[PDB]
């Protein structure tokens, strides 16, 4: 894809600007706000207000112990660990704002913004730069009794949740059909009595014969062709799905206590859907190895712009680069800048061992 | 680049085979160990006897304030840091070794490699994956004095060592000809009184706008064609530098009281020097966005395949990157062998 260059003839905001404004609030948009305020920008960060759902913290204040985010070797909390994050942001200086972004305008620089219940032409803020770190959810089906029995056995992370008691030698069912799937599927063989996948096609996603691996499996049954219509259960515990095969029309109950749905991420984008490039599931495109999207001055960080690894520490060193790229352009357009006194001119220091 | 596929006929190591080895100990590599221990893949690291002049841990453990690593809101020192990374690693099971990896062939895969002092040709052990993230050393630059003074007035890190009170309201200069050496003088004028920038050609490597700021700063100048020859003070720090001009020959001496070298990020790479695809600079090429080398098998992580951001935290998700397409490589295998 190409970047387009915006015209920087857009009006300043008299009610705020900023040299930098970041959109979103897991790890990777608190570390581009560390570095940022350690780099004396005076970042602006958008934590949300319930923002898609999630509160300020973003995916990691919706699961327990994180154990593979190096630096904790007796494991941490996601709900400790964001809080250090946004104390660490706040810290050096960032201005945390808990307020959900409900429109940005990329035509022109700077780009104008505006928040939730603010959000008349007048009320627009403006920002030389924007990093986007709006992160992602897990998608999800919404069977009728999904509302009853999601987190009462119905699951999106086979990983974080296949041991927990209410599976353990169980029938448990998989959605899904790519390596995600067959991936989950063979990890839920630890702690389950059975574990179905359902696919809705009679072939593979997942190499042909990694999925072979699934059929000879003796705790595994592939049933292909076939869906899931229904959730059922008891009032506490799911305890069977309606399931269909799409091809000889069969269907019937399928007793499990657990469901883990293995379809992929839902990129949290509507911020800018018909204003970035996107890539075929929705995700935002950068230059790869870079934060850089299809429009000058315009990052983006985190899983937003990640469907491959989806990691804490992943998301987090993406907003680094995210903040360190945003500064970089911001110090070469002050660097242009006649007007500017040379002493008042912002130059990067985030470097150790110099490179010249 | 191509990414060269290795054959898979060679002979495994009687003394030790591995699934995946993992050279190196910053935070690249133990990253991508606690990634690997908890995939049970059992992953063997090489933290180093002293590699590189850093001891296990990586070059943080010369500096005693990390700041920027999220999740340590207080800040931590380097070592702290590292050695809560190695707890990490071995809590899940990583097999951490004090050992220099000193040769690797990867003609073949498993592929063969040999810790410093068990060089013999038998004594190989195997690995069928590699993740290099053997990082970068501080390159010292040639000057005479610079044993006497360095860490007693000359350094390498000026934003680590700029504050500290022997540079106080002193002058100081800053060796380097590009966007380091601008950004780490621009830095010291908060320090200093007066920062000098040797600069070794007659122009800038910065941008012109950015060559053309550094000049025109009131508590900066821009030296050009200017070189240090001799590191001086009195026997306990540094008082002053001899300079010479490379394109007049005239010797000077200039009055610091510190030196900063904005050059000297050399990425450690003596390992694979013509065995994986290097940029000029020495720098592990990946195809973007992966931690995938020139040859299928070997992935790099860490400042050893970044010249650009060059951060704990970007080397700690590259290394679980380098994992999770080590892991993917190693998975695929097994299901395919029948
Ligand atoms: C159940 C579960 C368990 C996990 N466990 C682990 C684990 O053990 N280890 C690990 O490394 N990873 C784990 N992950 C993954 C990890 O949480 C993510 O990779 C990471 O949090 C993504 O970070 P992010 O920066 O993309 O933002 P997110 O974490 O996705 O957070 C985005 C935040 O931005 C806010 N936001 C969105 N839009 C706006 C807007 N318009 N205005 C303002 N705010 C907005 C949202 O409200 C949200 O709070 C887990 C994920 C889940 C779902
Ligand atoms: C003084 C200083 C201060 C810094 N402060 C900060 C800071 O505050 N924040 C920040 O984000 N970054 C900081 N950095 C940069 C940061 O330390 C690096 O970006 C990061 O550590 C790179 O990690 P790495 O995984 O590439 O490995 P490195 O940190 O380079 O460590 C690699 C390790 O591998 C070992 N090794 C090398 N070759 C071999 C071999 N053949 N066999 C076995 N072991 C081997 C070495 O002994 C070394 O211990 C600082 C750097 C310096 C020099
Ligand atoms: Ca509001
Ligand atoms: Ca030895
Ligand atoms: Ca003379």
Known sequence: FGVREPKRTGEVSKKMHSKV???????G???????????????????????????????????????NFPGFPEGVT???????????????????????????????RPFKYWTEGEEEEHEFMTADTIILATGASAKRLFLPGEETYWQSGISACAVCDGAVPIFRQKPLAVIGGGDSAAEEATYLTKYGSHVYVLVRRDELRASKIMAKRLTSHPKVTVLWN????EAKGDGEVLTSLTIKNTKTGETGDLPVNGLFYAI?????????????????????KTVP?????????????????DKKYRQAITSAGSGCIAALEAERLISEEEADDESLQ?????????????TD
């Open 226 to 229: 076939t869906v899931a219509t």
């Open 29 to 67: 948009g608190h570390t581009a706000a560390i570095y940022l305020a350690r780099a004396n920008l005076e970042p602006v960060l958008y934590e949300g207000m319930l923002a898609n759902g999630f509160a300020p913290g973003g995916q990691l204040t919706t699961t327990t112990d994180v154990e």
């Open 78 to 108: 996601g709900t400790e660990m964001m809080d250090k994050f946004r104390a660490q942001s706040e810290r050096f200086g960032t201005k945390i704002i808990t307020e959900t972004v409900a429109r940005v305008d990329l035509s022109v």
């Open 21 to 27: 404004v970041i959109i979103g609030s897991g790890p």
């Open 342 to 354: 040379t002493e008042d001119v912002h130059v990067p220091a985030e470097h150790y061992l110099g």
């Open 264 to 284: 992929g991420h839902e990129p949290a984008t509507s911020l800018v859907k018909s204003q970035v490039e996107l890539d075929s599931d929705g995700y935002i």
């Open 289 to 305: 190895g870079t934060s850089q999207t299809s429009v000058h001055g315009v990052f983006a960080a985190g899983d937003v712009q």
